Amino acid sequence: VHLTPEEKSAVTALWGKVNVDEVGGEALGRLLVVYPWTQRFFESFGDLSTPDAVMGNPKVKAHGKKVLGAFSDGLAHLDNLKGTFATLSELHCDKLHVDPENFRLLGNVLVCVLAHHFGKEFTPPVQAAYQKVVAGVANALAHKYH
Amino acid sequence: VHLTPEEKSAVTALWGKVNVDEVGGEALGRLLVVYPWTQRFFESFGDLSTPDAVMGNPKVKAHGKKVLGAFSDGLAHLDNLKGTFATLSELHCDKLHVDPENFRLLGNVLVCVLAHHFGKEFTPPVQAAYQKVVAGVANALAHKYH
Protein backbone atom coordinates (compact mmCIF):
# COMPACT_ATOMS: atom_id res chain seq x y z
CA VAL A 1 0.00 0.00 0.00
CA HIS A 2 1.09 3.58 -0.71
CA LEU A 3 -0.32 5.60 2.20
CA THR A 4 1.12 9.00 3.09
CA PRO A 5 2.14 9.50 6.73
CA GLU A 6 -0.96 11.68 7.11
CA GLU A 7 -3.15 8.88 5.73
CA LYS A 8 -1.67 6.15 7.93
CA SER A 9 -2.44 8.36 10.94
CA ALA A 10 -5.99 8.96 9.70
CA VAL A 11 -6.51 5.22 9.24
CA THR A 12 -5.25 4.36 12.74
CA ALA A 13 -7.08 7.27 14.43
CA LEU A 14 -10.43 6.15 12.99
CA TRP A 15 -9.80 2.43 13.56
CA GLY A 16 -9.14 3.00 17.25
CA LYS A 17 -12.82 4.04 17.49
CA VAL A 18 -14.08 0.89 15.81
CA ASN A 19 -15.76 -2.02 17.61
CA VAL A 20 -14.16 -4.72 15.44
CA ASP A 21 -16.58 -7.50 16.46
CA GLU A 22 -19.65 -5.42 15.57
CA VAL A 23 -18.28 -3.97 12.34
CA GLY A 24 -17.12 -7.42 11.28
CA GLY A 25 -20.58 -8.91 11.72
CA GLU A 26 -22.18 -5.97 9.92
CA ALA A 27 -19.75 -6.05 6.96
CA LEU A 28 -19.91 -9.80 6.36
CA GLY A 29 -23.69 -9.75 6.77
CA ARG A 30 -24.09 -6.86 4.32
CA LEU A 31 -21.79 -8.63 1.82
CA LEU A 32 -24.17 -11.63 1.85
CA VAL A 33 -27.25 -9.44 1.47
CA VAL A 34 -25.93 -6.99 -1.17
CA TYR A 35 -24.10 -9.60 -3.29
CA PRO A 36 -26.09 -12.78 -2.53
CA TRP A 37 -24.02 -15.07 -4.73
CA THR A 38 -21.36 -14.77 -1.99
CA GLN A 39 -23.57 -16.97 0.20
CA ARG A 40 -22.15 -19.86 -1.90
CA PHE A 41 -19.34 -20.40 0.65
CA PHE A 42 -21.68 -20.53 3.65
CA GLU A 43 -24.06 -23.44 3.02
CA SER A 44 -23.32 -24.69 6.56
CA PHE A 45 -24.39 -21.42 8.20
CA GLY A 46 -28.12 -22.17 8.07
CA ASP A 47 -30.88 -19.67 7.17
CA LEU A 48 -29.67 -16.85 4.88
CA SER A 49 -33.00 -16.37 3.04
CA THR A 50 -33.84 -12.77 3.99
CA PRO A 51 -31.87 -9.68 5.03
CA ASP A 52 -32.72 -10.17 8.73
CA ALA A 53 -32.00 -13.92 8.50
CA VAL A 54 -28.51 -13.02 7.26
CA MET A 55 -27.74 -10.04 9.51
CA GLY A 56 -28.84 -11.75 12.75
CA ASN A 57 -27.49 -15.18 11.80
CA PRO A 58 -25.28 -16.11 14.80
CA LYS A 59 -22.75 -17.90 12.55
CA VAL A 60 -22.53 -14.95 10.16
CA LYS A 61 -21.89 -12.69 13.17
CA ALA A 62 -19.29 -15.05 14.64
CA HIS A 63 -17.49 -15.37 11.32
CA GLY A 64 -17.59 -11.61 10.82
CA LYS A 65 -15.69 -11.10 14.09
CA LYS A 66 -13.08 -13.66 12.99
CA VAL A 67 -12.66 -12.06 9.56
CA LEU A 68 -12.46 -8.44 10.71
CA GLY A 69 -10.29 -9.41 13.70
CA ALA A 70 -7.69 -10.64 11.20
CA PHE A 71 -8.14 -7.52 9.06
CA SER A 72 -7.64 -5.44 12.20
CA ASP A 73 -4.43 -7.22 13.09
CA GLY A 74 -3.29 -6.59 9.53
CA LEU A 75 -3.62 -2.83 10.08
CA ALA A 76 -0.69 -3.03 12.52
CA HIS A 77 1.44 -4.28 9.63
CA LEU A 78 0.71 -1.98 6.69
CA ASP A 79 4.30 -2.18 5.48
CA ASN A 80 4.12 -5.99 5.32
CA LEU A 81 0.61 -7.00 4.28
CA LYS A 82 1.70 -9.78 1.94
CA GLY A 83 3.71 -11.44 4.67
CA THR A 84 1.08 -11.03 7.37
CA PHE A 85 -1.67 -12.53 5.16
CA ALA A 86 0.44 -15.27 3.54
CA THR A 87 -0.99 -18.31 5.37
CA LEU A 88 -4.57 -16.97 5.17
CA SER A 89 -4.00 -16.44 1.41
CA GLU A 90 -2.85 -20.08 1.00
CA LEU A 91 -5.81 -21.29 3.04
CA HIS A 92 -8.42 -19.32 1.06
CA CYS A 93 -7.00 -20.61 -2.25
CA ASP A 94 -6.06 -24.23 -1.48
CA LYS A 95 -8.66 -25.20 1.10
CA LEU A 96 -11.60 -22.77 0.87
CA HIS A 97 -11.43 -22.11 -2.90
CA VAL A 98 -12.49 -18.49 -2.51
CA ASP A 99 -12.34 -16.28 -5.62
CA PRO A 100 -10.26 -13.23 -4.49
CA GLU A 101 -12.91 -10.94 -6.05
CA ASN A 102 -14.81 -11.68 -2.82
CA PHE A 103 -12.12 -9.83 -0.82
CA ARG A 104 -12.66 -6.79 -3.03
CA LEU A 105 -16.42 -6.85 -2.64
CA LEU A 106 -16.03 -7.17 1.15
CA GLY A 107 -13.66 -4.22 1.07
CA ASN A 108 -16.26 -2.03 -0.63
CA VAL A 109 -18.97 -3.15 1.79
CA LEU A 110 -16.57 -2.37 4.67
CA VAL A 111 -16.05 1.17 3.34
CA CYS A 112 -19.84 1.67 3.17
CA VAL A 113 -20.18 0.37 6.74
CA LEU A 114 -17.50 2.77 8.05
CA ALA A 115 -19.22 5.67 6.29
CA HIS A 116 -22.60 4.60 7.75
CA HIS A 117 -21.23 4.33 11.29
CA PHE A 118 -19.04 7.44 11.31
CA GLY A 119 -21.08 9.73 9.09
CA LYS A 120 -19.49 13.11 8.42
CA GLU A 121 -16.28 11.99 10.17
CA PHE A 122 -15.72 9.60 7.23
CA THR A 123 -14.54 12.46 5.01
CA PRO A 124 -13.55 12.14 1.36
CA PRO A 125 -9.82 12.14 2.25
CA VAL A 126 -10.42 9.56 5.01
CA GLN A 127 -12.30 7.36 2.53
CA ALA A 128 -9.43 7.60 0.03
CA ALA A 129 -7.03 6.34 2.73
CA TYR A 130 -9.28 3.36 3.53
CA GLN A 131 -9.75 2.49 -0.18
CA LYS A 132 -5.95 2.08 -0.37
CA VAL A 133 -6.08 -0.11 2.74
CA VAL A 134 -8.85 -2.49 1.59
CA ALA A 135 -7.26 -2.84 -1.85
CA GLY A 136 -3.93 -3.65 -0.20
CA VAL A 137 -5.46 -6.22 2.10
CA ALA A 138 -7.40 -7.75 -0.79
CA ASN A 139 -4.19 -7.93 -2.85
CA ALA A 140 -2.32 -9.51 0.04
CA LEU A 141 -5.01 -12.17 0.44
CA ALA A 142 -4.86 -12.93 -3.31
CA HIS A 143 -1.06 -13.12 -3.47
CA LYS A 144 -0.54 -16.84 -2.81
CA TYR A 145 -3.20 -17.95 -5.29
CA HIS A 146 -1.95 -20.22 -8.04
CA VAL B 1 2.95 -12.52 -10.41
CA HIS B 2 6.01 -11.80 -12.54
CA LEU B 3 7.51 -13.94 -15.28
CA THR B 4 9.37 -17.17 -14.70
CA PRO B 5 12.62 -17.51 -16.70
CA GLU B 6 10.80 -19.85 -19.08
CA GLU B 7 7.93 -17.42 -19.55
CA LYS B 8 10.42 -14.63 -20.24
CA SER B 9 12.03 -16.80 -22.90
CA ALA B 10 8.62 -17.58 -24.37
CA VAL B 11 7.78 -13.89 -24.65
CA THR B 12 11.08 -12.90 -26.28
CA ALA B 13 11.11 -15.88 -28.67
CA LEU B 14 7.62 -15.04 -29.95
CA TRP B 15 8.29 -11.31 -30.08
CA GLY B 16 11.36 -11.86 -32.28
CA LYS B 17 8.90 -12.99 -34.97
CA VAL B 18 6.52 -10.06 -34.67
CA ASN B 19 6.17 -7.46 -37.38
CA VAL B 20 5.60 -4.57 -34.98
CA ASP B 21 4.46 -2.20 -37.76
CA GLU B 22 1.59 -4.52 -38.78
CA VAL B 23 0.66 -5.79 -35.31
CA GLY B 24 0.65 -2.21 -33.99
CA GLY B 25 -1.62 -0.93 -36.73
CA GLU B 26 -3.90 -3.95 -36.39
CA ALA B 27 -4.06 -3.60 -32.57
CA LEU B 28 -4.95 0.08 -32.42
CA GLY B 29 -7.32 -0.37 -35.36
CA ARG B 30 -9.19 -3.24 -33.69
CA LEU B 31 -9.29 -1.29 -30.42
CA LEU B 32 -11.15 1.56 -32.16
CA VAL B 33 -13.52 -0.91 -33.83
CA VAL B 34 -14.28 -3.34 -30.95
CA TYR B 35 -14.51 -0.62 -28.25
CA PRO B 36 -15.56 2.44 -30.33
CA TRP B 37 -15.73 4.84 -27.42
CA THR B 38 -11.90 4.77 -27.49
CA GLN B 39 -12.16 6.88 -30.65
CA ARG B 40 -12.69 9.87 -28.31
CA PHE B 41 -8.92 10.57 -28.25
CA PHE B 42 -8.55 10.56 -32.03
CA GLU B 43 -11.03 12.99 -33.54
CA SER B 44 -8.25 14.63 -35.57
CA PHE B 45 -7.42 11.36 -37.34
CA GLY B 46 -10.17 11.73 -39.90
CA ASP B 47 -12.60 9.04 -41.04
CA LEU B 48 -13.19 6.34 -38.39
CA SER B 49 -16.82 5.75 -39.40
CA THR B 50 -16.50 2.09 -40.44
CA PRO B 51 -14.24 -0.87 -39.64
CA ASP B 52 -12.52 -0.52 -43.05
CA ALA B 53 -12.08 3.23 -42.60
CA VAL B 54 -10.44 2.70 -39.19
CA MET B 55 -8.10 -0.12 -40.25
CA GLY B 56 -7.09 1.71 -43.42
CA ASN B 57 -6.72 5.11 -41.76
CA PRO B 58 -3.05 6.17 -42.17
CA LYS B 59 -2.95 8.04 -38.86
CA VAL B 60 -4.34 4.98 -37.05
CA LYS B 61 -1.59 2.85 -38.61
CA ALA B 62 1.06 5.47 -37.85
CA HIS B 63 -0.07 5.71 -34.24
CA GLY B 64 -0.41 1.94 -33.84
CA LYS B 65 3.20 1.55 -34.94
CA LYS B 66 4.39 4.26 -32.52
CA VAL B 67 2.53 2.78 -29.55
CA LEU B 68 3.57 -0.82 -30.19
CA GLY B 69 7.10 0.43 -30.85
CA ALA B 70 7.21 1.76 -27.28
CA PHE B 71 5.64 -1.50 -26.05
CA SER B 72 8.39 -3.42 -27.90
CA ASP B 73 11.15 -1.29 -26.33
CA GLY B 74 9.59 -1.92 -22.91
CA LEU B 75 9.99 -5.67 -23.39
CA ALA B 76 13.72 -5.14 -22.87
CA HIS B 77 12.95 -3.86 -19.34
CA LEU B 78 10.63 -6.59 -18.01
CA ASP B 79 12.24 -6.21 -14.58
CA ASN B 80 11.62 -2.46 -14.39
CA LEU B 81 8.43 -1.67 -16.30
CA LYS B 82 7.46 1.18 -13.92
CA GLY B 83 10.81 2.89 -14.36
CA THR B 84 10.90 2.62 -18.15
CA PHE B 85 7.32 3.85 -18.66
CA ALA B 86 7.40 6.55 -15.96
CA THR B 87 7.65 9.53 -18.33
CA LEU B 88 5.03 8.08 -20.66
CA SER B 89 2.74 7.51 -17.66
CA GLU B 90 3.03 11.15 -16.58
CA LEU B 91 2.44 12.24 -20.19
CA HIS B 92 -0.69 10.14 -20.70
CA CYS B 93 -2.08 11.49 -17.40
CA ASP B 94 -1.07 15.17 -17.38
CA LYS B 95 -1.24 16.01 -21.08
CA LEU B 96 -3.26 13.37 -22.90
CA HIS B 97 -5.81 12.70 -20.13
CA VAL B 98 -6.07 9.04 -21.10
CA ASP B 99 -8.02 6.78 -18.71
CA PRO B 100 -5.59 3.88 -17.99
CA GLU B 101 -8.41 1.43 -18.63
CA ASN B 102 -7.64 2.10 -22.29
CA PHE B 103 -4.24 0.46 -21.79
CA ARG B 104 -5.94 -2.69 -20.52
CA LEU B 105 -8.34 -2.82 -23.46
CA LEU B 106 -5.44 -2.43 -25.91
CA GLY B 107 -3.72 -5.24 -24.02
CA ASN B 108 -6.76 -7.52 -24.58
CA VAL B 109 -6.86 -6.63 -28.28
CA LEU B 110 -3.09 -7.19 -28.67
CA VAL B 111 -3.39 -10.72 -27.25
CA CYS B 112 -6.19 -11.49 -29.73
CA VAL B 113 -4.09 -10.12 -32.60
CA LEU B 114 -1.05 -12.19 -31.57
CA ALA B 115 -3.33 -15.25 -31.50
CA HIS B 116 -4.79 -14.33 -34.89
CA HIS B 117 -1.32 -13.98 -36.41
CA PHE B 118 0.43 -16.98 -34.80
CA GLY B 119 -2.46 -19.44 -34.67
CA LYS B 120 -1.47 -22.72 -33.00
CA GLU B 121 1.93 -21.35 -31.95
CA PHE B 122 0.17 -18.94 -29.56
CA THR B 123 -0.36 -21.79 -27.11
CA PRO B 124 -2.17 -21.45 -23.76
CA PRO B 125 1.17 -21.22 -21.85
CA VAL B 126 2.44 -18.56 -24.24
CA GLN B 127 -0.83 -16.66 -23.87
CA ALA B 128 -0.49 -16.77 -20.06
CA ALA B 129 2.99 -15.21 -20.23
CA TYR B 130 1.74 -12.45 -22.54
CA GLN B 131 -1.26 -11.80 -20.26
CA LYS B 132 1.27 -11.13 -17.49
CA VAL B 133 3.22 -8.87 -19.85
CA VAL B 134 0.29 -6.68 -20.94
CA ALA B 135 -1.01 -6.35 -17.39
CA GLY B 136 2.46 -5.26 -16.25
CA VAL B 137 2.74 -2.71 -19.05
CA ALA B 138 -0.73 -1.30 -18.38
CA ASN B 139 0.05 -1.13 -14.65
CA ALA B 140 3.33 0.66 -15.42
CA LEU B 141 1.61 3.23 -17.67
CA ALA B 142 -0.99 3.84 -14.97
CA HIS B 143 1.49 4.13 -12.11
CA LYS B 144 2.16 7.90 -12.24
CA TYR B 145 -1.49 8.91 -12.45
CA HIS B 146 -2.61 11.29 -9.72
Next chain:
Amino acid sequence: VLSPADKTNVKAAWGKVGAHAGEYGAEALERMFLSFPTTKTYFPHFDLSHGSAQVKGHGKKVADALTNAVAHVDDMPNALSALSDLHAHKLRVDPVNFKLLSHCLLVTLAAHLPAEFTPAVHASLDKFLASVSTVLTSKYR
Protein backbone atom coordinates in the same frame (compact mmCIF):
# COMPACT_ATOMS: atom_id res chain seq x y z
CA VAL C 1 -34.10 -6.03 -12.52
CA LEU C 2 -35.58 -4.10 -9.60
CA SER C 3 -38.20 -5.96 -7.57
CA PRO C 4 -41.20 -4.25 -5.95
CA ALA C 5 -39.31 -4.16 -2.65
CA ASP C 6 -36.21 -2.71 -4.36
CA LYS C 7 -38.32 0.14 -5.77
CA THR C 8 -39.99 0.81 -2.44
CA ASN C 9 -36.49 0.94 -0.91
CA VAL C 10 -35.06 3.29 -3.51
CA LYS C 11 -38.04 5.65 -3.34
CA ALA C 12 -37.83 5.81 0.47
CA ALA C 13 -34.09 6.53 0.59
CA TRP C 14 -34.02 9.04 -2.27
CA GLY C 15 -37.13 10.71 -0.85
CA LYS C 16 -35.25 11.35 2.41
CA VAL C 17 -32.35 12.75 0.39
CA GLY C 18 -34.83 15.33 -0.89
CA ALA C 19 -33.44 18.84 -1.28
CA HIS C 20 -29.89 17.63 -0.52
CA ALA C 21 -29.58 15.66 -3.77
CA GLY C 22 -27.30 18.20 -5.44
CA GLU C 23 -24.97 18.52 -2.44
CA TYR C 24 -24.74 14.72 -2.24
CA GLY C 25 -23.99 14.45 -5.94
CA ALA C 26 -21.15 16.95 -5.49
CA GLU C 27 -19.82 15.05 -2.46
CA ALA C 28 -19.96 11.79 -4.38
CA LEU C 29 -17.89 13.42 -7.13
CA GLU C 30 -15.29 14.72 -4.66
CA ARG C 31 -15.01 11.24 -3.07
CA MET C 32 -14.58 9.66 -6.50
CA PHE C 33 -11.87 12.09 -7.62
CA LEU C 34 -9.88 11.51 -4.41
CA SER C 35 -10.29 7.74 -4.11
CA PHE C 36 -10.05 7.01 -7.85
CA PRO C 37 -7.78 9.69 -9.44
CA THR C 38 -8.06 8.13 -12.89
CA THR C 39 -11.66 9.40 -13.08
CA LYS C 40 -10.26 12.94 -13.20
CA THR C 41 -9.06 12.29 -16.74
CA TYR C 42 -12.66 12.98 -17.85
CA PHE C 43 -12.67 16.45 -16.29
CA PRO C 44 -9.45 18.24 -17.43
CA HIS C 45 -11.49 21.38 -18.08
CA PHE C 46 -12.68 21.47 -14.45
CA ASP C 47 -11.47 23.24 -11.33
CA LEU C 48 -11.69 20.11 -9.13
CA SER C 49 -10.73 21.82 -5.88
CA HIS C 50 -12.89 21.37 -2.79
CA GLY C 51 -16.14 23.27 -3.15
CA SER C 52 -15.55 24.44 -6.71
CA ALA C 53 -18.64 25.75 -8.48
CA GLN C 54 -18.05 23.40 -11.40
CA VAL C 55 -18.13 20.31 -9.18
CA LYS C 56 -21.21 21.65 -7.35
CA GLY C 57 -22.91 22.39 -10.65
CA HIS C 58 -22.05 18.98 -12.09
CA GLY C 59 -23.09 17.21 -8.88
CA LYS C 60 -26.50 18.87 -9.20
CA LYS C 61 -26.88 17.58 -12.76
CA VAL C 62 -25.98 14.01 -11.77
CA ALA C 63 -28.29 14.07 -8.76
CA ASP C 64 -31.15 15.45 -10.91
CA ALA C 65 -30.73 12.64 -13.44
CA LEU C 66 -30.90 10.13 -10.58
CA THR C 67 -34.02 11.91 -9.23
CA ASN C 68 -35.55 11.58 -12.71
CA ALA C 69 -34.63 7.88 -12.87
CA VAL C 70 -36.33 7.32 -9.51
CA ALA C 71 -39.42 9.23 -10.72
CA HIS C 72 -39.59 6.91 -13.75
CA VAL C 73 -38.22 3.77 -12.13
CA ASP C 74 -40.43 1.52 -14.28
CA ASP C 75 -39.28 3.21 -17.53
CA MET C 76 -35.60 4.07 -17.03
CA PRO C 77 -34.28 3.11 -20.49
CA ASN C 78 -36.67 5.69 -21.99
CA ALA C 79 -36.43 8.35 -19.29
CA LEU C 80 -32.61 8.29 -19.55
CA SER C 81 -32.48 7.93 -23.35
CA ALA C 82 -31.01 11.35 -24.16
CA LEU C 83 -28.39 10.91 -21.39
CA SER C 84 -27.48 7.45 -22.63
CA ASP C 85 -27.03 8.87 -26.15
CA LEU C 86 -24.83 11.63 -24.71
CA HIS C 87 -22.50 9.31 -22.81
CA ALA C 88 -22.29 6.80 -25.69
CA HIS C 89 -21.77 9.16 -28.63
CA LYS C 90 -19.97 12.14 -27.12
CA LEU C 91 -18.59 11.86 -23.56
CA ARG C 92 -17.64 8.23 -24.11
CA VAL C 93 -16.64 7.62 -20.50
CA ASP C 94 -15.23 4.10 -20.26
CA PRO C 95 -17.83 1.72 -18.73
CA VAL C 96 -15.55 0.72 -15.86
CA ASN C 97 -15.96 4.18 -14.30
CA PHE C 98 -19.66 3.96 -13.61
CA LYS C 99 -19.16 1.48 -10.78
CA LEU C 100 -16.66 3.91 -9.23
CA LEU C 101 -19.09 6.84 -9.09
CA SER C 102 -21.88 4.45 -8.00
CA HIS C 103 -19.71 3.23 -5.12
CA CYS C 104 -19.02 6.82 -4.06
CA LEU C 105 -22.74 7.68 -4.24
CA LEU C 106 -23.49 4.75 -1.93
CA VAL C 107 -20.76 5.87 0.45
CA THR C 108 -22.19 9.40 0.41
CA LEU C 109 -25.73 8.12 1.11
CA ALA C 110 -24.42 5.84 3.89
CA ALA C 111 -22.70 8.86 5.50
CA HIS C 112 -25.88 10.96 5.30
CA LEU C 113 -28.67 8.43 5.95
CA PRO C 114 -27.96 6.74 9.28
CA ALA C 115 -31.54 5.55 9.81
CA GLU C 116 -32.52 4.52 6.30
CA PHE C 117 -29.30 2.94 4.99
CA THR C 118 -30.30 -0.55 6.19
CA PRO C 119 -28.79 -3.70 4.65
CA ALA C 120 -31.89 -4.21 2.46
CA VAL C 121 -31.92 -0.56 1.32
CA HIS C 122 -28.16 -0.68 0.68
CA ALA C 123 -28.76 -3.76 -1.49
CA SER C 124 -31.59 -2.10 -3.41
CA LEU C 125 -29.67 1.14 -3.99
CA ASP C 126 -26.66 -0.84 -5.28
CA LYS C 127 -28.93 -2.64 -7.78
CA PHE C 128 -30.58 0.67 -8.74
CA LEU C 129 -27.24 2.43 -9.46
CA ALA C 130 -26.10 -0.64 -11.40
CA SER C 131 -29.33 -0.41 -13.46
CA VAL C 132 -28.76 3.28 -14.11
CA SER C 133 -25.15 2.54 -15.15
CA THR C 134 -26.26 -0.26 -17.49
CA VAL C 135 -28.77 2.08 -19.14
CA LEU C 136 -26.14 4.81 -19.52
CA THR C 137 -23.64 2.47 -21.25
CA SER C 138 -26.23 0.44 -23.23
CA LYS C 139 -25.68 2.30 -26.52
CA TYR C 140 -21.88 2.35 -26.41
CA ARG C 141 -21.50 -0.14 -29.27
Next chain:
Amino acid sequence: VLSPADKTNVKAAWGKVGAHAGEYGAEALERMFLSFPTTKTYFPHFDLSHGSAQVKGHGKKVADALTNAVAHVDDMPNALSALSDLHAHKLRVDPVNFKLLSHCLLVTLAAHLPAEFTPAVHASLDKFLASVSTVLTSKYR
Protein backbone atom coordinates in the same frame (compact mmCIF):
# COMPACT_ATOMS: atom_id res chain seq x y z
CA VAL D 1 -27.88 -4.99 -28.15
CA LEU D 2 -26.81 -7.12 -31.11
CA SER D 3 -27.46 -5.48 -34.48
CA PRO D 4 -28.49 -7.42 -37.60
CA ALA D 5 -24.87 -7.20 -38.72
CA ASP D 6 -23.65 -8.70 -35.42
CA LYS D 7 -26.05 -11.65 -35.72
CA THR D 8 -24.93 -12.35 -39.27
CA ASN D 9 -21.27 -12.10 -38.21
CA VAL D 10 -21.73 -14.44 -35.25
CA LYS D 11 -23.72 -17.03 -37.19
CA ALA D 12 -21.07 -17.08 -39.92
CA ALA D 13 -18.07 -17.37 -37.61
CA TRP D 14 -19.61 -19.91 -35.23
CA GLY D 15 -20.94 -21.87 -38.19
CA LYS D 16 -17.35 -22.32 -39.32
CA VAL D 17 -16.45 -23.76 -35.91
CA GLY D 18 -18.57 -26.78 -36.70
CA ALA D 19 -17.47 -30.08 -35.21
CA HIS D 20 -14.62 -28.31 -33.41
CA ALA D 21 -17.01 -26.62 -30.94
CA GLY D 22 -16.24 -28.91 -27.99
CA GLU D 23 -12.52 -28.74 -28.77
CA TYR D 24 -12.53 -24.93 -28.81
CA GLY D 25 -14.55 -24.73 -25.61
CA ALA D 26 -12.05 -27.00 -23.83
CA GLU D 27 -9.15 -24.97 -25.23
CA ALA D 28 -10.78 -21.74 -24.08
CA LEU D 29 -11.13 -23.19 -20.59
CA GLU D 30 -7.49 -24.27 -20.46
CA ARG D 31 -6.36 -20.79 -21.55
CA MET D 32 -8.52 -19.25 -18.83
CA PHE D 33 -7.18 -21.52 -16.06
CA LEU D 34 -3.59 -20.81 -17.07
CA SER D 35 -3.95 -17.08 -17.74
CA PHE D 36 -6.27 -16.25 -14.84
CA PRO D 37 -5.68 -18.91 -12.15
CA THR D 38 -8.27 -17.40 -9.82
CA THR D 39 -10.92 -18.94 -12.11
CA LYS D 40 -9.71 -22.35 -10.89
CA THR D 41 -11.43 -21.63 -7.55
CA TYR D 42 -14.64 -22.71 -9.30
CA PHE D 43 -13.39 -26.15 -10.34
CA PRO D 44 -11.73 -27.69 -7.24
CA HIS D 45 -13.59 -30.91 -8.07
CA PHE D 46 -11.93 -31.07 -11.51
CA ASP D 47 -8.69 -32.58 -12.65
CA LEU D 48 -7.45 -29.48 -14.46
CA SER D 49 -4.34 -30.99 -16.01
CA HIS D 50 -3.81 -30.76 -19.77
CA GLY D 51 -5.97 -33.22 -21.69
CA SER D 52 -8.27 -33.67 -18.69
CA ALA D 53 -11.46 -35.49 -19.68
CA GLN D 54 -13.47 -33.36 -17.26
CA VAL D 55 -12.25 -30.19 -18.94
CA LYS D 56 -12.88 -31.67 -22.37
CA GLY D 57 -16.36 -32.68 -21.25
CA HIS D 58 -17.10 -29.25 -19.84
CA GLY D 59 -15.71 -27.57 -22.95
CA LYS D 60 -18.31 -29.44 -24.95
CA LYS D 61 -21.16 -28.37 -22.70
CA VAL D 62 -20.08 -24.73 -22.90
CA ALA D 63 -19.76 -24.91 -26.68
CA ASP D 64 -23.20 -26.51 -27.07
CA ALA D 65 -24.74 -23.74 -24.93
CA LEU D 66 -23.14 -21.12 -27.19
CA THR D 67 -24.47 -22.97 -30.28
CA ASN D 68 -27.91 -22.90 -28.74
CA ALA D 69 -27.53 -19.15 -28.07
CA VAL D 70 -26.44 -18.47 -31.65
CA ALA D 71 -29.41 -20.47 -32.97
CA HIS D 72 -31.72 -18.43 -30.74
CA VAL D 73 -29.93 -15.10 -30.87
CA ASP D 74 -33.25 -13.21 -31.13
CA ASP D 75 -34.32 -14.47 -27.70
CA MET D 76 -31.36 -15.63 -25.69
CA PRO D 77 -32.96 -14.94 -22.28
CA ASN D 78 -35.55 -17.65 -22.88
CA ALA D 79 -33.21 -19.99 -24.75
CA LEU D 80 -30.74 -19.85 -21.85
CA SER D 81 -33.30 -19.65 -19.02
CA ALA D 82 -32.33 -22.89 -17.23
CA LEU D 83 -28.67 -22.01 -17.63
CA SER D 84 -29.10 -18.55 -16.12
CA ASP D 85 -31.07 -20.17 -13.27
CA LEU D 86 -28.19 -22.59 -12.68
CA HIS D 87 -25.45 -19.93 -12.47
CA ALA D 88 -27.59 -17.58 -10.35
CA HIS D 89 -28.97 -20.05 -7.78
CA LYS D 90 -26.31 -22.73 -7.56
CA LEU D 91 -22.92 -22.16 -9.25
CA ARG D 92 -22.87 -18.47 -8.30
CA VAL D 93 -19.69 -17.70 -10.24
CA ASP D 94 -18.74 -14.08 -9.50
CA PRO D 95 -19.76 -11.90 -12.50
CA VAL D 96 -16.17 -10.70 -12.96
CA ASN D 97 -15.18 -14.12 -14.35
CA PHE D 98 -17.40 -14.12 -17.43
CA LYS D 99 -15.25 -11.57 -19.31
CA LEU D 100 -12.28 -13.81 -18.55
CA LEU D 101 -13.80 -16.87 -20.22
CA SER D 102 -15.19 -14.59 -22.97
CA HIS D 103 -11.69 -13.23 -23.67
CA CYS D 104 -10.26 -16.74 -23.85
CA LEU D 105 -13.01 -17.85 -26.24
CA LEU D 106 -12.13 -14.89 -28.49
CA VAL D 107 -8.43 -15.83 -28.38
CA THR D 108 -9.28 -19.42 -29.21
CA LEU D 109 -11.42 -18.36 -32.18
CA ALA D 110 -8.71 -15.95 -33.44
CA ALA D 111 -6.19 -18.80 -33.27
CA HIS D 112 -8.39 -21.17 -35.29
CA LEU D 113 -10.28 -18.87 -37.70
CA PRO D 114 -7.59 -16.82 -39.46
CA ALA D 115 -9.79 -15.92 -42.43
CA GLU D 116 -13.03 -15.24 -40.53
CA PHE D 117 -11.69 -13.25 -37.56
CA THR D 118 -11.92 -9.82 -39.19
CA PRO D 119 -12.14 -6.66 -37.05
CA ALA D 120 -15.90 -6.47 -37.63
CA VAL D 121 -16.44 -10.14 -36.69
CA HIS D 122 -14.16 -9.75 -33.66
CA ALA D 123 -16.31 -6.82 -32.55
CA SER D 124 -19.52 -8.78 -33.11
CA LEU D 125 -18.24 -11.83 -31.25
CA ASP D 126 -17.08 -9.71 -28.32
CA LYS D 127 -20.55 -8.12 -28.13
CA PHE D 128 -22.20 -11.53 -28.45
CA LEU D 129 -20.18 -13.07 -25.60
CA ALA D 130 -20.96 -10.02 -23.49
CA SER D 131 -24.66 -10.49 -24.21
CA VAL D 132 -24.48 -14.18 -23.27
CA SER D 133 -22.59 -13.28 -20.08
CA THR D 134 -25.22 -10.65 -19.23
CA VAL D 135 -28.05 -13.17 -19.67
CA LEU D 136 -26.18 -15.71 -17.54
CA THR D 137 -25.77 -13.19 -14.69
CA SER D 138 -29.22 -11.58 -15.09
CA LYS D 139 -30.83 -13.51 -12.22
CA TYR D 140 -28.04 -13.06 -9.70
CA ARG D 141 -29.96 -10.70 -7.43
